[PDB]
Structure formats: C-alpha cells, structure tokens
Amino acid sequence: KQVEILRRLGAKRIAYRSDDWRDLQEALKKGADILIVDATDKDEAWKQVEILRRLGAKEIAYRSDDWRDLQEALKKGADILIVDATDWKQVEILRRLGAKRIAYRSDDWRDLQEALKKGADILIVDATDKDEAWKQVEILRRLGAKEIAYRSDDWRDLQEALKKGADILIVDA
C-alpha cells in the first residue's frame, strides 16, 4: 500500500513517475495526485498524456526539454511542465506558450533557487542520485521556496523530506 503509507507518513501530495503509462494509471487508481510522463527518453510522449486524460487522470505533469514537445503536451492536457534547471529566461516563454504550472528540476539547489527567482512554481529536488538531499529542501525553504517536490525511493529519506518541508513526494513506479 505505497500510496496509503505515503499518506500515513504525512504526504499531502503524491506524484508517480514511470515510463509506462499503464503504471501511471494504476497509480491513479491507487490515489496518486500527480502522474508524471517522461518525454526526455521516448517519442511522442504526449500520446501518454492523451491516454491518461481519456482514462480519467486530472493532473498530469510532463517532463521535457524540447519546446515543440512541451507545447504539444499542453495542447493534449498536461497541467504541469517539468523542465531542466541545469540548462531562466525560458520561464516567461513557457508562460506565453500557455504553461499554468512550471516545475524545474536540478541536482543543484542553486539552480532551483534561480528558477524560483524567475517565477518557477515548483522546485524538484532529486534524491535518487545523491545522499542527504533533504538538506536542499532545508536551504530552499529558508530562501523563500514554498512549493518543493522531492524525488526519492527510500522511505526514511522521503519522511525526512516531509519533515524538512517538502510539499510533493515523487516516487518511481
């Protein structure tokens, strides 16, 4: 009962990531709040957005670093765009494309802070490739960030992120 236990830990918003839209749908059925489609490693990933929307998903995020790809995801119903902060004047362009919610992902909290200063809505800290990543949550909260997402597959690590002020937990399905 991953979702159920995440809820018990105190997770108010839970996102699920997967290369298989079938996995995102199962997470939707289990109560996930956000489904994350990854377009950086496959073709026409907006077709996953279309499927999941037809199957009732109401909150879809789309990870891409390609402008026409991000635009197609918005057109197909994606609610959150996730872009790379490691390379932001792109924020205003994403806005004008039509993005209502913009998330930035980076291994470096300094990049996440720059994105925040330029108008990003969500900052994503990645704990799958480094230790004690909740220290990034800590710093970002003290630097004014109010909406931080934390990607990890370790239970104690996810809990520590919540305790340090992460608002969204991203788990890999």
Numbering used by the authors: 8 to 94, 99 to 184
Paper text:
Protein stability can be fine‐tuned by modifying different structural features such as hydrogen‐bond networks, salt bridges, hydrophobic cores, or disulfide bridges. Among these, stabilization by salt bridges is a major challenge in protein design and engineering since their stabilizing effects show a high dependence on the structural environment in the protein, and therefore are difficult to predict and model. In this work, we explore the effects on structure and stability of an introduced salt bridge cluster in the context of three different de novo TIM barrels. The results show that despite the similarities in protein fold, the salt bridge clusters differently influence the structural and stability properties of the de novo TIM barrel variants depending on the structural background where they are introduced.
